[PDB]
Amino acid sequence: HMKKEHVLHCQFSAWYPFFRGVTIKSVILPLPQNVKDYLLDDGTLVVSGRDWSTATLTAPEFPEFATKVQEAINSLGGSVFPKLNWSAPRDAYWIAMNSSLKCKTLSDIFLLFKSSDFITRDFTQPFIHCTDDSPDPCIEYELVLRKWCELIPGAEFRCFVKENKLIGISQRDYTQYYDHISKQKEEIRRCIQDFFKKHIQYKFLDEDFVFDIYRDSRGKVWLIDFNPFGEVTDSLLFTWEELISENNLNGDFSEVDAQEQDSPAFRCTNSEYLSYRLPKDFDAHKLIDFLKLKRNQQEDD
């Protein structure tokens, strides 16, 4: 029962003023109309402001917006992590230099955004999985420039809240094992409960929501983002069938392993993303063999 109002509350500019002191320093720039049209181009990719023996494509140039973005990047230290209203171009990592989302110019942001389907989803499918009959609100799209941080791998956790109650914590990179998570399992559990109780509980715009956190090298918990309490958010080591059910998410355990019941369920990966860099059509040997066959058939058709 996720409504379109819940998606609006998870926009960056909606919650950042209220949680500024517990998250990463960021700058929010309104997206100009012509810049929005550029990112929505249905043709081939040409990057804007990049500076033997056929057509030469040129992208639109936005001088006033490029200097505005560059001034915000300099105010954050010269390196930024770009997002839109909700999403980051996490699926366009392969195309950027050194496979990094760190951006120093507007051109770096353009190359990521126009190569990312998560960004395209923010424009074209913002209110998916919503169940209310209300008409789609008008979105005012914005560029979010977040100060770049060198995060430690295996220190990010997704937290699920239902009726202002923290009902579960999940490791965010749930497909990768990290040894230090299970050794610090109880200390992480306590620091996220204290953070939520002091800084998150009763302060977000909804009862049911999801929020991601990062625990730095000194043990301090930082806020990363707010996500909708619905199918649009990956439940990671949890399933939404048991998160809505409000059941005993801790599971079957003995009294020698179980802690207090007030604590939520904490799941991490025990001892044991790919379609991002592939096309929508998606072993490269069989793929090109399949390309030769289809090209010969299209010559006949």
Place this chain on the structure above:
Amino acid sequence: PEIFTELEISYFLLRRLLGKAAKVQKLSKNEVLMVNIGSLSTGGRVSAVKADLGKIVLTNPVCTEVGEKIALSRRVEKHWRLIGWGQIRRGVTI
């Protein structure tokens, strides 16, 4: 095997897209294509075009070798769509 920043390739484009699907446009300079090389992907900015040959300036240098076959995709309606394949003939290494 080395690390290449530019690639000289021989390419073959499909007549139309997969999945009456739309035709495939010819390669144009300064367009960025998605390049699938083995087990990794990268971007390729078209810098020179001939009937069967071409040069792409990689947005991110990869490790490959002369003779390895590649896959090419083009941004079509905000989706990466396969348009053809190529094979490396020459490369600029760093």
